[PDB]
Design an enzyme around this catalytic site. Structure first.
Site, PDB file in Angstrom:
ATOM      1  N   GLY A  60       0.809  -1.197   0.000  1.00  0.00           N
ATOM      2  CA  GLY A  60       0.000   0.000   0.000  1.00  0.00           C
ATOM      3  C   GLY A  60       0.847   1.254   0.000  1.00  0.00           C
ATOM      4  N   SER A  61       0.454   2.238   0.803  1.00  0.00           N
ATOM      5  CA  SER A  61       1.194   3.492   0.877  1.00  0.00           C
ATOM      6  C   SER A  61       2.174   3.518   2.051  1.00  0.00           C
ATOM      7  CB  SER A  61       0.236   4.678   0.990  1.00  0.00           C
ATOM      8  OG  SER A  61      -0.253   4.800   2.314  1.00  0.00           O
ATOM      9  N   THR A  62       3.182   4.369   1.944  1.00  0.00           N
ATOM     10  CA  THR A  62       4.186   4.516   2.986  1.00  0.00           C
ATOM     11  C   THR A  62       3.615   5.009   4.316  1.00  0.00           C
ATOM     12  OG1 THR A  62       5.999   4.805   1.428  1.00  0.00           O
ATOM     13  CG2 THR A  62       6.267   5.765   3.627  1.00  0.00           C
ATOM     14  N   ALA A  63       2.624   5.887   4.244  1.00  0.00           N
ATOM     15  CA  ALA A  63       2.002   6.424   5.444  1.00  0.00           C
ATOM     16  C   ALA A  63       1.288   5.318   6.216  1.00  0.00           C
ATOM     17  CB  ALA A  63       1.030   7.518   5.066  1.00  0.00           C
ATOM     18  N   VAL A  64       0.468   4.531   5.518  1.00  0.00           N
ATOM     19  CA  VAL A  64      -0.291   3.432   6.134  1.00  0.00           C
ATOM     20  C   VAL A  64       0.634   2.269   6.511  1.00  0.00           C
ATOM     21  CG1 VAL A  64      -2.264   1.826   5.879  1.00  0.00           C
ATOM     22  CG2 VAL A  64      -2.352   4.062   4.860  1.00  0.00           C
ATOM     23  N   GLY A  65       1.772   2.166   5.828  1.00  0.00           N
ATOM     24  CA  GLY A  65       2.723   1.117   6.140  1.00  0.00           C
ATOM     25  C   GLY A  65       3.208   1.300   7.564  1.00  0.00           C
TER      26      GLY A  65
ATOM     27  N   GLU B  13       5.584  -3.706   1.152  1.00  0.00           N
ATOM     28  CA  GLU B  13       5.816  -3.302  -0.219  1.00  0.00           C
ATOM     29  C   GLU B  13       5.096  -1.975  -0.338  1.00  0.00           C
ATOM     30  OE1 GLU B  13       7.811  -4.931  -2.055  1.00  0.00           O
ATOM     31  OE2 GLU B  13       7.643  -7.082  -1.683  1.00  0.00           O
TER      32      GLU B  13
ATOM     33  N   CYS C   6       3.046   0.120  -9.113  1.00  0.00           N
ATOM     34  CA  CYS C   6       4.089   0.381  -8.125  1.00  0.00           C
ATOM     35  C   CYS C   6       5.520   0.460  -8.658  1.00  0.00           C
ATOM     36  CB  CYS C   6       3.999  -0.645  -6.988  1.00  0.00           C
ATOM     37  SG  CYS C   6       3.168  -2.219  -7.437  1.00  0.00           S
TER      38      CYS C   6
HETATM   39  N1  LIG Z   1      -3.263   1.519  -3.419  1.00  0.00           N
HETATM   40  C1  LIG Z   1      -2.001   1.330  -3.834  1.00  0.00           C
HETATM   41  O1  LIG Z   1      -1.515   0.293  -4.364  1.00  0.00           O
HETATM   42  C2  LIG Z   1      -1.102   2.583  -3.652  1.00  0.00           C
HETATM   43  C3  LIG Z   1       0.244   2.234  -3.520  1.00  0.00           C
HETATM   44  C4  LIG Z   1       1.149   3.278  -3.357  1.00  0.00           C
HETATM   45  C5  LIG Z   1       0.854   4.645  -3.327  1.00  0.00           C
HETATM   46  N2  LIG Z   1      -0.527   4.892  -3.536  1.00  0.00           N
HETATM   47  C6  LIG Z   1      -0.763   6.350  -3.693  1.00  0.00           C
HETATM   48  O2  LIG Z   1      -0.777   7.002  -2.400  1.00  0.00           O
HETATM   49  C7  LIG Z   1      -1.866   8.018  -2.432  1.00  0.00           C
HETATM   50  C8  LIG Z   1      -3.071   7.638  -1.523  1.00  0.00           C
HETATM   51  O3  LIG Z   1      -3.463   6.313  -1.928  1.00  0.00           O
HETATM   52  P1  LIG Z   1      -4.471   5.354  -1.079  1.00  0.00           P
HETATM   53  O4  LIG Z   1      -4.395   4.038  -1.766  1.00  0.00           O
HETATM   54  O5  LIG Z   1      -4.054   5.629   0.336  1.00  0.00           O
HETATM   55  O6  LIG Z   1      -5.957   6.019  -1.313  1.00  0.00           O
HETATM   56  P2  LIG Z   1      -7.340   5.467  -0.722  1.00  0.00           P
HETATM   57  O7  LIG Z   1      -7.834   6.358   0.407  1.00  0.00           O
HETATM   58  O8  LIG Z   1      -8.341   5.299  -1.877  1.00  0.00           O
HETATM   59  O9  LIG Z   1      -6.992   3.983  -0.178  1.00  0.00           O
HETATM   60  C9  LIG Z   1      -6.689   3.880   1.244  1.00  0.00           C
HETATM   61  C10 LIG Z   1      -6.485   2.444   1.694  1.00  0.00           C
HETATM   62  O10 LIG Z   1      -5.799   2.664   2.993  1.00  0.00           O
HETATM   63  C11 LIG Z   1      -6.550   1.974   4.052  1.00  0.00           C
HETATM   64  N3  LIG Z   1      -6.384   2.633   5.372  1.00  0.00           N
HETATM   65  C12 LIG Z   1      -6.727   3.920   5.534  1.00  0.00           C
HETATM   66  N4  LIG Z   1      -6.551   4.222   6.833  1.00  0.00           N
HETATM   67  C13 LIG Z   1      -6.103   3.111   7.434  1.00  0.00           C
HETATM   68  C14 LIG Z   1      -5.803   2.981   8.784  1.00  0.00           C
HETATM   69  N5  LIG Z   1      -5.922   4.034   9.597  1.00  0.00           N
HETATM   70  N6  LIG Z   1      -5.389   1.755   9.185  1.00  0.00           N
HETATM   71  C15 LIG Z   1      -5.244   0.773   8.280  1.00  0.00           C
HETATM   72  N7  LIG Z   1      -5.523   0.898   6.968  1.00  0.00           N
HETATM   73  C16 LIG Z   1      -5.986   2.082   6.530  1.00  0.00           C
HETATM   74  C17 LIG Z   1      -8.005   2.008   3.579  1.00  0.00           C
HETATM   75  O11 LIG Z   1      -8.835   1.078   4.343  1.00  0.00           O
HETATM   76  C18 LIG Z   1      -7.876   1.870   2.046  1.00  0.00           C
HETATM   77  O12 LIG Z   1      -8.023   0.480   1.691  1.00  0.00           O
HETATM   78  C19 LIG Z   1      -2.201   8.130  -3.949  1.00  0.00           C
HETATM   79  O13 LIG Z   1      -1.227   9.020  -4.567  1.00  0.00           O
HETATM   80  C20 LIG Z   1      -2.041   6.678  -4.441  1.00  0.00           C
HETATM   81  O14 LIG Z   1      -1.771   6.633  -5.839  1.00  0.00           O
HETATM   82  C21 LIG Z   1      -1.502   3.920  -3.663  1.00  0.00           C
END
Ligand SMILES: NC(=O)c1ccc[n+]([C@@H]2O[C@H](COP(=O)([O-])OP(=O)(O)OC[C@H]3O[C@@H](n4cnc5c(N)ncnc54)[C@H](O)[C@@H]3O)[C@@H](O)[C@H]2O)c1
Ligand SMILES: NC(=O)c1ccc[n+]([C@@H]2O[C@H](COP(=O)([O-])OP(=O)(O)OC[C@H]3O[C@@H](n4cnc5c(N)ncnc54)[C@H](O)[C@@H]3O)[C@@H](O)[C@H]2O)c1
Lengths: 446, 446
Positions: free
Chosen positions: A186-191, A208, A242
């Protein structure tokens, strides 16, 4: 409830049924028949989430999982055997080997861009290692979330392999359970959030994440082939991958030539109007549609630049003479916007890259081998591909993973089996005889 | 202040000087001559912290680091080379390999029981991998902390390898800094904190925590040799060793025989009165002296049981017919107390072990190979040793690490190098020609 689901899976793993290599092969083959028998449904689900077509679906996602399945189903027996180790002088009469064993319950949290791949592929490794697996599909690509929730129990063991559906609330509750390993993409912040939850249970995680994968284009480079490859990888899933070439780094002299060849290749794939091509994809949702679009503002648009808010379409746009401090060079562009930044020398390309977080990928295009090696030897990134793009993540024999902000851990093929299992070091001295250990026991020599 | 020290190392690491494999070897040899030229002092510091004599200092600690150094210095060049990877049909003409590269700044936090080895050994693999290292010595073993803090600057690079002395407040502050990897050896509770801190920067961690390492003694077993080996590992550092056989599990039929054989070997190592043997160690401090001492209360002392509060001595005490619910069986005994817990069968021994957190080690003593194999195959622990104790931790060719509560990550020999570096997958197609990739680019076939 979610607790009950995690319990059901752990108790079933405790039964010991997954210890049978035969069992794993059957389950793995169940997974395999699930895909083959439902290609149509999967494709359709993929079409409704990101507008893919039968071909892009199979070749970009599904066909990768199937190659994985085939590699592991065939090699598992060899992977599971106790791996012998090199003996030392002191251990010449002893057995030194490495024993692999399941970790227990693994949590696989997928992403929206490649909802079938980023969920089922890691699972191949997890089932291979004899673990129970809980899949938490992305809610953003909701159509696949449902399909997976229905397909899994029709083919897999309903006590060991479970699917939990839900958004942030469901996940947060789920991250309070105890797993023996959490796989996350997923994203670095949520990672960060994920790791923090895992710390509470000392559970190991495979992360990843992503970033901005640079693409350096060297002067001594067949720009025609180079740009044909770069364009493919960059617009493949409407720029939503990615390991995609986020931006191009080059000498200003070839600035324009790159542009022409790119738009050429664009025509070869999607014709005159991308919005007409069935092979071009659509952005996941509105929020992302707005953010990618906003990134084109106050920028020098040489090509593309138009979009359709209704179908969440964004034309294959290219940008030139971009300012690294501008927003398109501050965030991961998860869309079809290719910025082109200019550097005066190779030294300059390297300092640039090294002044930012480490990326999941790094690409170099050049005919000069020495340039290829100097780029690699002086930068850091998850993986690399010289003179092509994306492809390194598709080789089973090449583990896939990041570094720093791109994440930690790896997972394709055997590297998957290792990661989802424990590698126990055993030193057996069943020889309770020949006790020439005298020198180790006290009293100490006077 | 701590911030500046971390800055010094990070900037120094950015200079790129570690890249030279020649530099690394000089820093590896420097460390080696530090050990070789200051053995007396190292032993002195060990004597003042744990009451060790030159013989137990060298053979239990110092000698292991010296073997590691000798292995890495000799095998570093080969470890550093790019690693070729097996090609697939689709990649036959390309170059596929794994390139290793430093992570950056690595923080090594050591434990008091083995204050020299637990800091300097992981460091050897860190220096070998071209990283900058910051040592955080245990304040509890105060003497080794002051020694290390003065010796390092004399031999190593004063920018790259820095020591930081401190207790809780200093480590807390130190854990706010950004590192590329955190090596930690200590308790489970503090491990959870280190990882939580890690979460903030997405930094990978190697955790060697503890647990209660079981020791099952089988009937069909040469009880003489067995107990001789068990008594050695168990009392080795006044029982204060991470991989020490914590407690014994056996069939009551031999409950008493083991007791006799153990105290016999005890006589062989420390004489009639251990408080007389110079080869017997002292408890680190008062706090631990008390906790360990109290574990003997309300217990059936079959041997030892006497203690000297003044010299922090606690005799090699044995306990029979111990209750699993009693405090000695609830916490890791970090002392010379050896409980004996009875079980009616092997199946029983196995269930006992599985019903508890995974241990760093699991030992099995038997003449029946089948019992050894059934044991390993049905339990899980960091490492294992059959018919001996401690020894697997001393083989460089055997990676050392835990599972679940005993920790995550491993670090001996080459595994140490792999762990302190990034293994980057590279797919080089310097071949910008022979472009037969037509089948991958759009438009999809009609
Ligand atoms: N989805 C991917 O594969 C991905 C990967 C890398 C970067 N990004 C990028 O990063 C940015 C934001 O993307 P996104 O995918 O966050 O948007 P999004 O808000 O549409 O998706 C968020 C995902 O993060 C999860 N999440 C949110 N808060 C959480 C928490 N507090 N605890 C656990 N899980 C949580 C959600 O349940 C959701 O499934 C965009 O620029 C996007 O392109 C997305
Ligand atoms: N020291 C070891 O190698 C070790 C290993 C395994 C188990 N144990 C056992 O665990 C129990 C307690 O041992 P102990 O060593 O914790 O006792 P202790 O209090 O003497 O040692 C504490 C160590 O933990 C550190 N620490 C404490 N709070 C911290 C914080 N908030 N953040 C970061 N680091 C912090 C301290 O600075 C110190 O070095 C005993 O039974 C002991 O035998 C000790």
């Amino acid at each position: 409830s979610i607790s009950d689901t995690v319990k059901r899976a752990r108790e079933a793993f405790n039964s010991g049924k997954t210890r049978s290599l035969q069992f794993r092969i059957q389950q793995l083959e169940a997974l395999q028949r699930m895909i083959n028998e439902n290609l149509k449904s999967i494709s359709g689900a993929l079409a409704s989430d990101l507008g893919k077509n039968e071909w892009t679906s199979y070749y970009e996602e599904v066909a990768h999982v199937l190659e994985e399945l085939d590699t592991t189903i065939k090699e598992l027996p060899d992977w599971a055997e106790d791996e012998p180790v090199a003996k030392t002088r002191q251990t010449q009469q002893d057995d030194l080997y490495i024993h692999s064993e399941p970790l227990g319950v693994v949590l696989v949290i997928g992403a929206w861009n490649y909802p079938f791949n980023l969920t089922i592929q890691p699972m191949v490794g997890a089932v291979a290692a004899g673990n129970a697996v809980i899949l938490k599909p992305s809610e953003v690509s909701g159509h696949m979330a449902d399909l997976l929730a229905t397909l899994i129990p029709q083919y897999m063991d309903q006590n060991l392999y479970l699917v939990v559906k839900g958004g942030v609330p469901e996940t947060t509750e789920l991250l309070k359970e105890r797993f023996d390993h959490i796989m996350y993409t997923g994203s670095t912040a949520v990672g960060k959030i994920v790791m923090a939850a895992a710390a509470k249970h000392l559970t190991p995680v495979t992360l990843e994440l992503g970033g901005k994968s640079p693409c350096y284009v060297d002067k001594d480079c067949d720009l025609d082939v180079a740009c044909r490859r770069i364009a493919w990888g960059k617009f493949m899933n409407s720029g939503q991958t990615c390991v995609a070439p986020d931006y191009i780094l080059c000498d200003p002299s070839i600035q324009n030539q790159i542009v022409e060849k790119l738009k050429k290749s664009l025509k070869d794939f999607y014709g005159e109007d991308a919005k007409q091509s069935r092979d071009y994809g659509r952005i996941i949702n509105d929020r992302h549609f707005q953010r990618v679009k906003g990134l084109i503002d106050n920028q020098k648009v040489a090509h593309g630049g138009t979009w359709d808010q209704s179908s969440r379409y964004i034309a294959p746009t290219i940008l030139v003479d971009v300012d690294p401090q501008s927003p398109v060079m501050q965030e991961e562009i998860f869309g079809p916007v290719m910025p082109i930044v200019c550097v005066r020398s190779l030294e300059e390309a390297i300092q640039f890259i090294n002044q930012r977080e480490k990326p999941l990928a790094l690409y170099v295009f050049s005919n000069n081998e020495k340039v290829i090696k100097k780029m690699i030897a002086e930068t850091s990134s998850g993986g690399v591909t010289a003179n092509d793009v994306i492809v390194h993540i598709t080789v089973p024999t090449l583990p896939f993973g990041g570094v720093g902000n791109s994440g930690m851990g790896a997972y394709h093929g055997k590297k998957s089996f290792e990661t989802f299992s424990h590698r126990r070091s055993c030193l057996v001295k069943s020889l309770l005889n020949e006790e020439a250990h005298k020198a180790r026991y006290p009293p100490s020599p006077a």
